[PDB]
Write a sequence for this structure.
């Protein structure tokens, strides 16, 4: 499957692509404003994620740090990123279909559109100014808007035993972005696409 990762933000981002225990394609790359990065994701990939990382510094060896979404100090992510990270999530060729969603369960750093580039389904978007509207207790000093699980580490926000409901914090993400997961047991906003579709993840789709 091909994914084009496009940075429409006015600021540089460091895109990342991982399935948690491995990089997807090269795993990460600097994307200046306007740049596009084309990756290949193996069919049948379950639990893949693409995200942006902000305000990074990497040396010639690909070692460094990001203010948001850092993946163990590496340019080329093998693991998932540190919240806050708006997430484009996907599981491909699952019983003949692809499943895509955007999630705020690990917080929000950059607005995103995640859409198919082939036919048969629709895209999803979370492009509201969540960082500007972020509740004071969730604001991440390094930048972005943390989710409540990251901040408070409670069973209610983290949804531990799969025993939770919506919260004042999850409702904030849901009000600003109804089409993105706001907590673990949120009514799914997953889109079912034809198996083996191609997609585009656009950071800052509205500017």
């Amino acid at each position: 499957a091909t994914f084009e990762i496009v940075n429409r933000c006015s600021y540089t981002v460091w895109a990342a692509a991982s399935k948690g225990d491995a990089a997807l394609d090269a795993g990460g790359r600097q994307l200046n404003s306007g740049e596009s990065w084309t990756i290949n994701v193996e069919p049948g990939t379950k639990g893949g994620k693409i995200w942006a990382r902000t305000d990074c510094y990497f040396d010639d060896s690909g070692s460094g740090i990001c203010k948001t979404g850092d993946c163990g100090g590496l340019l080329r992510c093998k693991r998932f990123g540190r919240p806050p990270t708006t997430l484009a999530e996907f599981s491909l060729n699952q019983y003949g279909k692809d499943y895509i969603d955007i999630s705020n369960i690990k917080g929000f750093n950059v607005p995103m559109d995640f859409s198919p580039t082939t036919r048969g389904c629709r895209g999803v978007r979370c492009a509201a100014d969540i960082v500007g509207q972020c509740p004071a207790k969730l604001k991440a000093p390094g930048g972005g808007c943390n989710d409540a699980c990251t901040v408070f580490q409670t069973s209610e926000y983290c949804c531990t035993t799969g025993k939770c409901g919506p919260t004042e914090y999850s409702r904030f993400f849901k009000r600003l972005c109804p089409d993105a997961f706001s907590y673990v047991l949120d009514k799914p906003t997953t889109v079912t696409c034809p198996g083996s579709s191609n997609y585009r993840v656009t950071f800052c789709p509205t500017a």
Remarks:
- The CA atoms of residues 111 and 127 lie 4 Å apart.
- The chain is about 10% helix and 35% strand.
- Helices lie at 130-133, 148-152, 155-158, 168-176.
- The longest strand covers residues 48-58.
